[PDB]
Amino acid sequence: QLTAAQELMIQQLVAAQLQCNKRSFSDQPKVTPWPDARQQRFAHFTELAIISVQEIVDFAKQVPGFLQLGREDQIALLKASTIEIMLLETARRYNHETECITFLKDFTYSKDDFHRAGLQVEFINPIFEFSRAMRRLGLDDAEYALLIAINIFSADRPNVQEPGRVEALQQPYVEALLSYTRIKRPQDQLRFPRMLMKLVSLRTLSSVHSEQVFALRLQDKKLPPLLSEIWD
Template sequence: MWQRCARRVTEAIERVVEFAKRLRGFLQLSQHDQIVLLKAGAMEVVLLRMCRAFDAASGTVLFEGKLAGPELFRSLGCPELVASVFDFARGLSALRCSESELALLSALLLLNAGRPWLQDRPRVARLQGQLDVLPAPGRLRALCSQHLEQVQAFRRLHPAGVSAAFPPLYRELFREEAEPAAGRGR
């Protein structure tokens, strides 16, 4: 199930990357800052966009072409994370955000000058300032941290499974900082 979810998340992250490339000024940032912003915000945007796949009437989410409830994800071994993600999707779905509103919120999540390790924070702040400023989405950050903790727990249980089973983009985005990045000096 982790492998199946990793593939779906990777597909969603690829769409987030394409969205980011279309944000005015994003491609003018250094490659380093683009990567920092994507690593920090991509999962937040994926969780945000999940509300479009959530069916409030049945409490299910569209997953691999079928409606699935939390019980399908039981084998992940992280029921609190699954419940939190479904609760978040339910709450966000109830807001009935338009595509424009979701796009604006997605842009705000991606162009966040408060992200650690940015090299040109003022430039990112200028891009961020071009958008309407909303309160910091702390719940998304908490869910992303919870997701990362569960990936790391899975990695400890199945160290070889992550390298063999997960798509390269997923492995790169959710690797531990102490791990060497693929293709960089080892």
């Protein structure tokens, strides 16, 4: 059974996830409308990424223990995980019946909509493959929030000054996930390792993204200062 201390920690994760998502709903009319059609779509996805960076920063701040790390390590952790949390979050917002992704909470996008924005098949295909594989695991809101916390507290990230402290903070989240999964599916048991293995997939996805970041140097419109920095 789950420990009361573990439940508290999870309750805080789910509340922060719900608060940050809700905070971004009001941005729906503020984003450039979906239809040069290609450029407008590219600028639309760009604005959506900017908002996602905000939610991630805002959520991480609410993760128990994140605020006790040094300021330099906090930023270093957030720099390397932003792409991976965006991917994790994309998967949570993926519907396999319609085969579509819900951004904000009304805005629906299909595989072809990303292709029509000038994004390469080299990157869009793995995104949808990852979303489908995540869907089969049947994660709930708590399981994603836990997985995102584990991802944030990665000690091997570049420019991390106190990796021992980062690693020690990841421990309760892995523990809570182990406990949470054992109660939800007592007869599976392979489900928990299958979740952790998705963190391995995320490493490759981030690496594929860094190679696809090259294709963006070709189009005349440059990425906003924020996005251009986090990704290159």
